[PDB]
Paper text:
Here, we report that a [name] [name] is a CTPase enzyme whose membrane-binding activity is directly regulated by a [name] switch. Unusually, [name] is also a peripheral membrane protein that directly associates with the cell membrane via a predicted N-terminal amphipathic helix (Adams et al., 2015). We provide evidence that (1) [name] is required for [name] to form the NBS-dependent nucleoprotein complex, and (2) [name] binding switches [name] from a membrane-inactive auto-repressed state to a membrane-active state.
The structure was solved by iodide SAD phasing, as no other [name] protein family structure was available as a template for molecular replacement. The asymmetric unit contains two similar copies of monomeric apo-[name] (root-mean-square deviation [RMSD] = 0.9 Å), hence we used the more complete subunit for all further analysis. Each [name]ΔCTD subunit contains an NTD (helices α1–α6) and an NBS-specific DNA-binding domain (DBD) (helices α7–α12) (Jalal et al., 2020b; Wu et al., 2009). From the structure, it is apparent that the visible membrane-targeting sequence (AA 5–10) of [name] is indeed amphipathic, with distinct polar and hydrophobic faces. We noted that the hydrophobic face of the amphipathic α1 helix is buried toward α5 and α7 at the core of [name] and thus is unexposed and unlikely to be available for membrane interaction.
Numbering used by the authors: 5 to 225
The structure:
């Protein structure tokens, strides 16, 4: 499990400061494919360009991590930004380290990398945490520790899955903030959550106003 959290540039740099650099291969750029288990990533082109400028001066401080796939192709485990950066530089080859990961591990890394890079919307974060917990028979604490997060960051997200559909839909549609949905969790009752949801959208209530209305509803006998 733990090694699936360790393939990104920062963590590879940290391990390499304690030991011999892994063997590097120079793989074809044309033969690289992004992780087939994560959706198409829409990067900030601005940040890919910053990264390309850094590499064109200072080299590629870490090789990407790939597994072998298909006929002589390489699937990214870590390094999609670097791969994108060296295309801007016109490279035909990129330094890489090859790891044998099975599909379940490659799928796990897809979720983990998406969590670490702070990509995901709240419900996406929730679904990713839920799946890593189910796949690996994990504690919320055990997962939070491995992600370098507080147990509450996980729980706040996992609880959004226990909310009713209408509230989840409102959060996904950005009709309410997460902190709105969070406060509605305290009501622990679908009917009250739905009535107060309609109020939030109709009167365009903020977080303070919603939290107050949740306390006043829970203060009732």
């Amino acid at each position: 499990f733990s090694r699936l959290f360790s393939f990104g540039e920062k963590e590879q740099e940290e391990m390499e400061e304690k030991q011999e650099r892994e063997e590097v291969r120079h793989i074809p750029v044309k033969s690289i494919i992004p992780n087939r288990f994560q959706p198409r990533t829409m990067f900030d082109e601005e940040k890919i360009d910053e990264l390309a400028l850094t590499i064109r001066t200072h080299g590629i401080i870490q090789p990407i991590v790939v597994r072998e796939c298909g006929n002589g192709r390489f699937e990214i485990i870590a390094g999609e930004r670097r791969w994108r950066a060296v295309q801007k530089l016109g490279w035909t080859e990129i330094p890489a380290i090859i790891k044998n990961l099975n599909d379940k591990e490659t799928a796990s890394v897809a979720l983990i990398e998406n969590l670490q890079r702070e990509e995901l919307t709240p419900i996406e974060e929730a679904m990713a945490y839920a799946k890593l917990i189910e796949l690996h028979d994990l504690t919320q604490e055990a997962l939070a520790q491995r992600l370098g997060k507080g147990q509450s960051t996980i729980a706040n997200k996992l609880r959004l899955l226990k909310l009713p559909q209408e509230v989840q839909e409102a959060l996904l549609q950005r009709a309410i903030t997460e902190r709105h949905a969070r406060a509605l969790i305290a009501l622990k009752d679908k009917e009250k959550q739905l009535k107060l949801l309609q109020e939030i959208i109709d009167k365009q209530l903020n977080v303070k106003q919603t939290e107050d209305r949740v306390l006043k509803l829970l203060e009732a006998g």
